[PDB]
Symmetry: C3
């Protein structure tokens, strides 16, 4: 049982300028995406899909947060391991969703910013919810990228983003791995968040000038780990450990990690006995927070442009295979 949602972005300047026509109709209430498929030859042809949620070009970042993350974030707190992926063609709002943007000329606080995506929102809520819940807790973040199956550490104290991590099988866990060299930062409070996210962005900006099409060919794994203490009446300590992975996948257009994931998601769906985690860096990193027993969701991002027809259809067929709902009448 994996959750699959779809988010159509609005038109960019390039599209308005080319007088783009839309071919995507999103029905929030019916949980349906509708695609106009016959160009000039057949005006009536439609292909329709159903998801667990459908957000239009209108959907505000917070609506996405509230609908997708909270119920998931709850499970993380109950001490489980969860992943949310953003998926789709380059240019369709994966990075906008997973992490959002800064409104120009410091105009709201980072946490007030209406353009902020899932990552910065999630961090804000983790403290909010746990500072006032009462118990003792710590919060650790990591951020790494995968490019041509090599691993980079965006939060590392090393000034050269190009120093590469390594990955080993975790002996204390048969579903886990150890990322040798991975920096994890203790986030002591709400007020430590931004500077961390800023240093991470600065490194990524550098990564992109060093390697070709770094932005679209790379996977971002942002990871939060929450540690939750409680003592018993006679002094013994019961730890809960929660783990959320926020994953900004490489662009889907037509990459070992990307195809491999697809097959892992299939193997989980139609329940074929061997699921091929080992095959890619990304599915090995992720394995531990996949399999069921832990909530997984997928935000599929599409474009509304006519130009992006095939790409959009392809995204949708991919999402549909991840979870197959029949259409209502």
């Amino acid at each position: 049982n994996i959750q699959v949602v779809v988010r159509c972005r609005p038109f960019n300047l390039a599209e308005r300028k080319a007088s783009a026509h839309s071919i995507v109709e999103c029905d929030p209430v019916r949980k349906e995406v509708s695609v106009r498929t016959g160009g000039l030859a057949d005006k009536s042809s439609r292909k329709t899909y159903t998801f667990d949620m459908v957000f239009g070009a209108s959907t505000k970042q917070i609506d996405v947060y509230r609908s997708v993350v909270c119920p998931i974030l709850d499970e993380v707190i109950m001490g489980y391991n969860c992943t949310i992926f953003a998926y789709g063609q380059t240019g369709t709002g994966k990075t906008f969703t997973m992490e959002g943007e800064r409104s120009p000329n410091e105009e709201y606080t980072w946490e007030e910013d209406p353009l902020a995506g899932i990552i910065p929102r999630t961090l804000h809520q983790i403290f909010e919810k746990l500072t006032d819940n009462g118990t003792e807790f710590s919060v650790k973040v990591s951020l790494l990228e995968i490019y041509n199956e090599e691993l980079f550490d965006l939060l590392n104290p090393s000034s050269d983003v190009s120093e590469r991590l390594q990955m080993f099988d975790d002996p204390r866990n048969k579903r886990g791995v150890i990322i040798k060299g991975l920096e994890e930062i203790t986030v002591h409070n709400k007020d430590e968040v931004y500077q961390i996210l800023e240093k991470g962005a600065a490194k990524r900006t550098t990564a992109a000038t060093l390697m070709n099409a770094y932005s679209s060919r790379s996977h971002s794994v942002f990871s939060v780990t929450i540690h939750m203490k409680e003592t018993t009446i006679d002094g013994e300590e019961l730890v809960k450990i929660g783990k959320l992975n926020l994953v900004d996948l490489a662009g889907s257009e037509n990459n070992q990690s990307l195809l491999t994931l697809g097959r892992v998601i299939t193997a989980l769906v139609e329940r074929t006995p061997h699921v091929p985690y080992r095959e890619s860096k990304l599915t090995r990193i992720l394995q531990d927070s996949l399999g069921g027993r832990t909530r997984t969701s997928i935000i599929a991002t599409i474009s509304p442009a006519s130009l992006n027809l095939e790409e959009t259809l392809s995204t949708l067929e991919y999402a549909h295979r991840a979870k197959n709902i029949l259409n209502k009448p």
Copy 2:
């Protein structure tokens, strides 16, 4: 009746001038011959020479091409046959210049008196000149589609988004023909309607290029003009296709590739000819071994840099002389 093939060599462009280019191409209009100098610094004497139905050297103007090639063909179209002219050769050699032409800067001339105007505008002008006089009742429909990455686009459509796609089907009426579903055919009521249409055409293409990669040199351009003629009651229907191919130096090359294969099958006389394997060859099926009369303008550059492509375009053009058609 054999495809006629002509060769047109353009003059050097500024970039060639600036790089001090040597010509390696000699045209002899009167013997109808092109001779290419193939041996660089190594062998100053070796040449490859070819004979064609006509050869146009560097200093050939737009009007010369019109009078030698297009006039005789438009008269055949006016007598109710079908004809096709296509431009073949390397990027930058003047396929577009020959097929469409250019507007001289500063509006120095009227569109129909512009000496840079190419075959499509001259032809439209002459369909009108020639038929208003002769006195018959007639109409003229035009269409314009581009093939890019095996997808069909409609330059003249009223739709504002160039990317809306056409579809292609077998004609149940004509065993070699196709139906292009959704293709706007514009009725041209007269000469003074011509320009605006072409200009909307141009602007739509300009948008296509900003949307799609290497659109200009990777796409094929199919311009069609249907003439209905009335003259008890006797009607003739003439059709003329003006095609402007992808750059010959070249999914993405499928129509060019299939064109080549279709041509070889026709010249070697292989029993089965793969027209169906590309959108371009399905559209041209009647021009290539069917009953349309066909002419090819093979364009070439005179520069030494372009030697291998020049040879390639000449060999390819020369063998296409061997294809037999058979009008009405």
Copy 3:
């Protein structure tokens, strides 16, 4: 002999410092070792260490490279051996800088005293300096060709179009040699004639880059100096080839491709070395297993980003030390 192999590491460039690059390369001139840190953030102790005939760190200047590598080689050329020095490495690591160098801006220095002059300019100076002294009668001729996409171009040709191609034939009076048909070999009567000749070759090369895709990173440069010494009463001939290979990371790459297969076969004493399968390996047949005496300058960047390509340059160069030539 064995092919001599030396390594040159360049300093950081502007982009590397902007990016805050760390070094992963430590050169030890005394031990003749190059040591690369391969563990990144994961593993601080892993290294890969290679011993060469000579190693030049980031602070090495053109003159140091010249005294240690070329002076000895030119001494041998003067006693009439054949010699080859070629530069191998990823794009941007300093092949051209080593073989040719650059001119300092604003005419601050005579070409003879330019601290940035590479091997080619300094050899030509030194050749006259040495022989003007001995008073033995001598002549010097030069030539400079480039290979791109398996085509040959002559940068010293009097022909104004750099794209007129050369061709290549077996040498009838040498089993391992070729003759380049059309190659301008220029007699250099005195040091005062050297600079204008380089200037012209450079300008012809500037034009070539504007005419062909990635011409500078995909082409091989072959500069050849021939020295005739009238001495007994005999002619002694010394040949020096200075070769600047295309980027290692790379018909477009046929010559690099065959260069690798030729090297592999020389290391595994394989029956038939495919010298004929590219223009380059045919030009270099003597220098690769033949009677010519060969040095390879492997060029590398110090930056962590370039780890994979640096190692591969080092593996590739290192193995070429096993190969042996038998000089004159």
